[PDB]
Amino acid sequence: SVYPKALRDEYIMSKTLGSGEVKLAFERKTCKKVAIKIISKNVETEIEILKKLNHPCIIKIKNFFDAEDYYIVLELMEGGELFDKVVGNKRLKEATCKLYFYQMLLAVQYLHENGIIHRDLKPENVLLSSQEEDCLIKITDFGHSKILTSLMRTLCGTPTYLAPEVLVSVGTAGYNRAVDCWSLGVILFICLSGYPPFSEHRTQVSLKDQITSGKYNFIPEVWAEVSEKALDLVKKLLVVDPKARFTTEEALRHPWLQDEDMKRKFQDLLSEENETALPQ
Ligand SMILES: C/C(=N\NC(=N)N)c1ccc(NC(=O)Nc2ccc(/C(C)=N/NC(=N)N)cc2)cc1
């Protein structure tokens, strides 16, 4: 078939960047490059979540066309996916891990402050600003995300007729955001080590069983490279109990992230990006 005429009106379409599919396009008005995500026919709440969020490490929506398929126009991230930096047991300098992870933490912190849980954080959904190693990252893909109740309403009686399991669920309610911190844990583990914590590669233990026990695959030889501090943070994010797991605030306060050089590099990268006159 063809691209829709409203899209064609504003954009010249071009090569595939990835794949669900992402294409290169040029905005006609500006002659600048954009990315167009095509979702073959919830997207309208993803759009509405993305419209309202404003953070430098979260992807912005430029335009939207709901046609035969959906078309989401976004800023082009020249560095591609973090996934490509970590496949085939490739891995990043610990310093590069920290810079990227710091930014992931700020993004997810901002999400959680604003009542949004992402629910699908993985290396594919972390985009790099450039092909430089030191760059900005943005989190994308909010198609599984949730806005943070019926429980609160339920607890306004008088539980004369209320079922025990509802009363039991009160102990653990309101920690759904901790799933994001788990994922961040897994991504950090991968970035630091070049391999996955939980995997069916050369184990008899099921993936499910590995995850619910929290018994990640530790290969000391791969990790001898890595600081104890980095591994300590991983350990606090890969905690099975969601009430005990580190929050993004706790992670940002961890020794590993008290790194003024890393933080300066990030502030520098932001300035470069931003780049109107001000009173004084
Ligand atoms: C230019 C380029 N890579 N160059 C390179 N040398 N690797 C890019 C490759 C992939 C790439 N990926 C994306 O932009 N990926 C996205 C963007 C948005 C989304 C969204 C919003 N998805 N929503 C959804 N419901 N699925 C998903 C994936 C950007 C740039």
From Swiss-Prot:
Residues with Phosphothreonine modification = 154, 158
Q: Which GO terms describe its molecular function?
A: ATP binding; identical protein binding; metal ion binding; protein homodimerization activity; protein kinase binding; protein serine kinase activity; protein serine/threonine kinase activity; ubiquitin protein ligase binding
Tell me its cofactors. Mg(2+)
Catalytic reaction equation(s): L-seryl-[protein] + ATP = O-phospho-L-seryl-[protein] + ADP + H(+); L-threonyl-[protein] + ATP = O-phospho-L-threonyl-[protein] + ADP + H(+)
Found in which tissues? Answer: High expression is found in testis, spleen, colon and peripheral blood leukocytes. Low expression is found in other tissues.
What is the name of the protein in this document? Serine/threonine-protein kinase Chk2
Q: How is it modified after translation?
A: Phosphorylated. Autophosphorylates at Thr-154 and Thr-158 in the T-loop/activation segment upon dimerization to become fully active and phosphorylate its substrates like for instance CDC25C. DNA damage-induced autophosphorylation at Ser-150 induces CUL1-mediated ubiquitination and regulates the pro-apoptotic function. Phosphorylation at Ser-227 also regulates ubiquitination. Phosphorylated by PLK4.
Q: Where in the cell is it found?
A: Nucleus, PML body; Nucleus, Nucleoplasm
Q: For this entry, list what GO says about its biological process.
A: cell division; cellular response to bisphenol A; cellular response to gamma radiation; cellular response to stress; cellular response to xenobiotic stimulus; DNA damage checkpoint signaling; DNA damage response; DNA damage response, signal transduction by p53 class mediator
**What disease is mentioned for this protein?**
Tumor predisposition syndrome 4: A disorder characterized by an increased risk for developing various types of benign and/or malignant neoplasms that arise at an accelerated rate and in different organs.
- Any known activators or inhibitors? Activation is modulated by several mediators including MDC1 and TP53BP1. Induces homodimerization with exchange of the T-loop/activation segment between protomers and transphosphorylation of the protomers. The autophosphorylated kinase dimer is fully active.
Query: Corresponding gene?
Result: CHEK2
Tell me which residues this entry annotates as catalytic.
Answer: 120 (proton acceptor)
